[PDB]
């Protein structure tokens, strides 16, 4: 018999993104080639099958630095990290291939699905 | 020119609640009288003006245990912690006074607003 606040989840995600922009309580650095991305482990886990697996591992859960596969493009990662914290995906003709490949590696099934749909249309 | 995934924020919150139920990456214990509640500092901050102030403090940001004011009712806190992680508020005739008082202390303005509306109707 609960009541529900429709905007609560969106408001929570907006505040988590504000904490990210101000580098508050970030507990991991994701290294992609020369580029470094600070984030919250819990948000990464909530969005990605790969980060979920990494941070539930009894040894890796304690690492402050995670290095991604050298094939991963920093721009594709940046677009996906922004999507994790906002629900908004900056999908463009020039980045769609790098975004889909990064989403497949990160195991972000809904992003992979829209990339496949957008590629099929063109 | 971004696209948006409507269910993303709700799905993120659902996964953060699953991490909470399994005690994964919880980094704080909130003590309310004899009762203890494990949570994620970032989620508490995103939902509450009080926790936002506590964990942005250069000294308190590093505490693993936070003790609430002895006037705070553990059941009222439990109902509010559940709302933080689900958007669902278990508001009942028998708990509305304890929930409103706890939401005022935690600085959760939308919960305070619905409690005031529900009290006014009766």
């Amino acid at each position: 018999s609960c009541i529900q606040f429709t905007r609560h989840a969106s408001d929570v995600l907006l505040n988590l993104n504000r904490l990210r922009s101000r580098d508050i309580l970030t507990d991991v650095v994701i290294v992609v080639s020369r580029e470094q991305f600070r984030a919250h482990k819990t948000v990464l886990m909530a969005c990605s099958g790969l980060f979920y697996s990494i941070f539930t591992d009894q040894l890796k859960c304690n690492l402050s630095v995670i290095n991604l596969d050298p094939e991963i493009n920093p721009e594709g990662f940046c677009i996906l990290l922004d999507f994790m914290y906002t629900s908004r995906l900056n999908l463009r003709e020039g980045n769609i291939m790098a975004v889909m490949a990064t989403a497949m590696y990160l195991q972000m099934e809904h992003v992979v699905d829209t990339c496949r749909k957008f590629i099929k249309a063109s | 020119s971004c696209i948006q995934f409507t269910r993303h924020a709700s799905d993120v919150l659902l996964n953060l609640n699953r991490l909470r139920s399994r005690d994964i990456l919880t980094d704080v214990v909130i003590v309310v009288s004899r009762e203890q509640f494990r949570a994620h500092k970032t989620v508490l901050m995103a939902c509450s003006g009080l926790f936002y102030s506590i964990f942005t403090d250069q000294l308190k940001c590093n505490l693993s245990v936070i003790n609430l004011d002895p006037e705070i009712n553990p059941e009222g806190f439990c109902i509010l912690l559940d709302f933080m992680y689900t958007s669902r508020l278990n508001l009942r005739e028998g708990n509305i006074m304890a929930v409103m008082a706890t939401a005022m202390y935690l600085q959760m303005e939308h919960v305070v607003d619905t409690c005031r509306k529900f009290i006014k109707a009766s």
């Binding site: 609960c2 009541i3 529900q4 606040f5 429709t6 | 669902r88 508020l89 619905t114």
Partner: peptide
């Protein structure tokens, strides 16, 4: 607020 809604009835979910």
């Amino acid at each position: 607020w809604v009835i979910p």
